[PDB]
Amino acid sequence: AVVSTDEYVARTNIYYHAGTSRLLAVGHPYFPIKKPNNNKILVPKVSGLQYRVFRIHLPDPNKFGFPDTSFYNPDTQRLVWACVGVEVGRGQPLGVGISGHPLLNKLDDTENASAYAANAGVDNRECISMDYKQTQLCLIGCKPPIGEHWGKGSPCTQVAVQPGDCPPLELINTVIQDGDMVDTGFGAMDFTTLQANKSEVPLDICTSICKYPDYIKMVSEPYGDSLFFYLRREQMFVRHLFNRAGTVGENVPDDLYIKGSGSTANLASSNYFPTPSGSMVTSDAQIFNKPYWLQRAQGHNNGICWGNQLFVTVVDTTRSTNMSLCAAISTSETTYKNTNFKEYLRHGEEYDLQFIFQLCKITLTADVMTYIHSMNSTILEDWNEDPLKKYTFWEVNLKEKFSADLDQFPLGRKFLLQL
């Protein structure tokens, strides 16, 4: 049996404030800039379609330098930090960003014809681009966020295929790491393995995984340690409608229509896909830059930063606008000249994490002691290998950032005017 941390946790009236003065990221919107031969990234991918998963490091209270230590008993009760205030500061102008591919598998427009189209010269791919689904979302937990996407989940043992017989899909749950790819409107899934074509979706994603947060499974989580706060805001629509060029993988059944004549007697690809478009971004609808008061929570854990760890997962499209820049090869020329300028694409991203933490304690009884055990062994052990080694989050160290006086910060100032 599980129960509200509000049971076994005690809350004190000691509040601290904490926040990275201003994070920054700058890169290239689709792919990483590395050496021609070497594999070192002299510039990294940085788009507004990557989930920024921050890992907040919190000082052990159990050792923190408190100006007083009467509020608690070092012998029976140990201290836990607790979150109540989070505000995910974004500091970039709202705009939209565009992604694309030089060789997009796109046959012909299907939105509206005027004549059954022509024969694909073999290879018909073309250069087209779009504006991905708008997705604004933030997740807070003391455990990493868990997404989902499709993929190929090695077969049923029988007919080990004739190269081609389409992939076994299989829902795959996974840890959302900083850097992963949001849904963009083409589903969530593994492009690198579902699409051998290597060119059915813009440059940034065709080589990646498009992950979507398994709310359902996270909320279904017992201890409710995954996320306790979270707010999503996603919206997209059909902009164009297109046809996948390529061979027929499965044939349209001959009972669904009737044969043609010459032109109409050879069927055009009946595999259509549409490009998405996250409509107009609006200020009146920002999730960020807005304070989230975590006083209560439908889940059992309620802001108990077990492990002194905090996981903030943000995904923000509204300020995706990647800028281009070009530089000249020589200042001589008096006349524009196509091969006299080099063109580049970059994208910035300005973050500003804000936090308000509540000091707590927990006297360790028998049933206490066993629960904290039966829940997370480490908590007791730690209390005085890393399962998160295999993962990569944006690491944040807030240990020398805590401050008691919220009278000196924007986020306390407000938190103080609420409670």
Six-digit token string for 101: 């591919």
| Min separation Cβ 133 and a second copy, Å | 6
| Min separation Cβ 216 and a second copy, Å | 4
| Min separation Cβ 74 and a second copy, Å | 30
Q: Is 80 helix (H, G, I), strand (E, B) or coil?
A: strand
Residue 320's nearest CA partner among 25, 28, 138, 98 is 98
On whether the CB atoms of residues 360 and 8 are closer than 8 A, the answer is: no
Full 3-state SS string of 117-151: CCCCCCCCCEEEEEECCEEEEEEEECCCCEEEEEC
Six-digit token string for 39: 């594999």
Pick from 348, 363, 382, 383 the residue near a second copy by CB under 8 A: 348
Pick from 337, 365, 367, 377 the residue near a second copy by CB under 8 A: 337
Q: Does 156 bind a second copy (CB under 8 A)?
A: no
| R_g of the chain computed on alpha carbons | 26
Which residues inside 95-154 make contact with a second copy, applying CB under 8 A?
95-103, 105-106, 108-117, 120-131, 133, 148, 150
On whether the CB atoms of residues 350 and 61 are closer than 8 A, the answer is: no
Q: Which residue has the tokens 């900083």?
A: 178
Residue 228's nearest CA partner among 289, 158, 299, 177 is 299
Which residues inside 355-414 make contact with a second copy, applying CB under 8 A?
405, 407-410, 413-414
Taking the least distance from each CB to a second copy, the nearer of 106 and 143 is 106
289 CB contacts (<8 Å, ≥6 apart)? 87, 88, 89, 90
Q: Which residue has the tokens 């014809």?
A: 113
Residue 56's nearest CA partner among 357, 398, 291 is 398
Interface pattern 250-289 for a second copy (x via CB under 8 A): x-xx-xxxxxxx-xxx-xxxxxxxx-xx-xxxxxx----x
Q: Does 324 bind a second copy (CB under 8 A)?
A: yes
Q: Does 292 bind a second copy (CB under 8 A)?
A: no
- As a whole number of angstroms, the distance between CA 154 and CA 235 comes to 33
Six-digit token string for 384: 């005085």
21 CB contacts (<8 Å, ≥6 apart)? 352
Taking the least distance from each CB to a second copy, the nearer of 128 and 294 is 128
| Min separation Cβ 156 and a second copy, Å | 11
Residue 404's nearest CA partner among 356, 364, 335 is 356
CB-count exposure of residue 113 (10 Å: 0-12, 13-18, 19+): exposed
Which amino acid would we find at residue 51? Y
Which residues inside 214-243 make contact with a second copy, applying CB under 8 A?
214-217, 219-220, 222, 232-243
Taking the least distance from each CB to a second copy, the nearer of 223 and 391 is 223
| Min separation Cβ 86 and a second copy, Å | 15
| Min separation Cβ 223 and a second copy, Å | 10
| Min separation Cβ 120 and a second copy, Å | 6
Taking the least distance from each CB to a second copy, the nearer of 76 and 129 is 129
Q: Does 334 bind a second copy (CB under 8 A)?
A: yes
Cα 88 off chain centre by: 14
| Min separation Cβ 35 and a second copy, Å | 11
Binding segment toward a second copy, per CB under 8 A, in 59-67, 69-77, 326-334, 356-364: 326-334
Cα 257 off chain centre by: 43
Across 164-224, where does the E strand assignment appear?
172-175, 189-190, 209-210, 212-213
| Min separation Cβ 239 and a second copy, Å | 8
Taking the least distance from each CB to a second copy, the nearer of 73 and 231 is 231
Q: Does 341 bind a second copy (CB under 8 A)?
A: yes
| Min separation Cβ 346 and a second copy, Å | 6
Which residues inside 161-220 make contact with a second copy, applying CB under 8 A?
163-167, 169, 171, 183, 185-189, 194-200, 203, 206-207, 212, 214-217, 219-220
Which residues inside 13-42 make contact with a second copy, applying CB under 8 A?
21-22, 24, 26, 28, 30-34
| Min separation Cβ 72 and a second copy, Å | 27
Which residues inside 70-99 make contact with a second copy, applying CB under 8 A?
89-99
Pick from 340, 376, 378, 403 the residue near a second copy by CB under 8 A: 340
Please count the residues of this chain forming the interface with a second copy, following the rule CB under 8 A.
173
On whether the CB atoms of residues 237 and 147 are closer than 8 A, the answer is: no
Which residues face 349 on adjacent strands? 25
